Design a protein around this ligand. Sequence first.
Ligand SMILES: CSc1ccccc1-c1ccc(C(=O)N(C)CC2(F)CCCCC2)c(S(C)(=O)=O)c1
Length: 178
Amino acid sequence: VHITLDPDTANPWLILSEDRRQVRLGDTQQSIPGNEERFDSYPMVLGAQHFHSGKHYWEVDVTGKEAWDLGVCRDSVRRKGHFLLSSKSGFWTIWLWNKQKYEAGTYPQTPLHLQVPPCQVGIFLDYEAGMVSFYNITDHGSLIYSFSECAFTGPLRPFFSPGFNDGGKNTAPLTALC
Ligand SMILES: CSc1ccccc1-c1ccc(C(=O)N(C)CC2(F)CCCCC2)c(S(C)(=O)=O)c1
């Protein structure tokens, strides 16, 4: 129930808090040991938990960030090199990036029109239903987007990115909310 970030998966540009509930962009590619699970080309990290069934929920503070990506991914997603975050490649995510532009990771991408920019985002997974939904905590829990008919067959993982290094313009953390 209590999501924790998995240091073995974390790109070396990421700083994880000791309690593994916060991740942020660092200023220098750290010199952490290597291992097959680590995202080597993007500032990405997984939650340690693996879901095979059930409903599951977590919540992330994004206050003060100009860019981030949140969602769920297959355990089997590739870790090394470059790739696109498509449902075919095993990703169900939403993101914030450019001039305050929110998008859902469909092909083609789906612009999301959020009158109230979220300070916290809820992520709700229902394995058996094939559903991942995103809630705008700041706008009283309004539905941002839902992926349906996901037809999961393998284990799933919480997926996070605090954005891209931009010169300290995006050092605010993602924080998992109790
Ligand atoms: C470090 S992740 C991050 C962190 C903060 C904000 C944004 C992102 C981020 C979102 C989507 C992509 C991506 O896959 N695309 C845009 C392609 C596509 F639209 C192609 C059509 C299917 C959906 C995905 C990428 S990426 C891997 O290209 O850098 C990065």
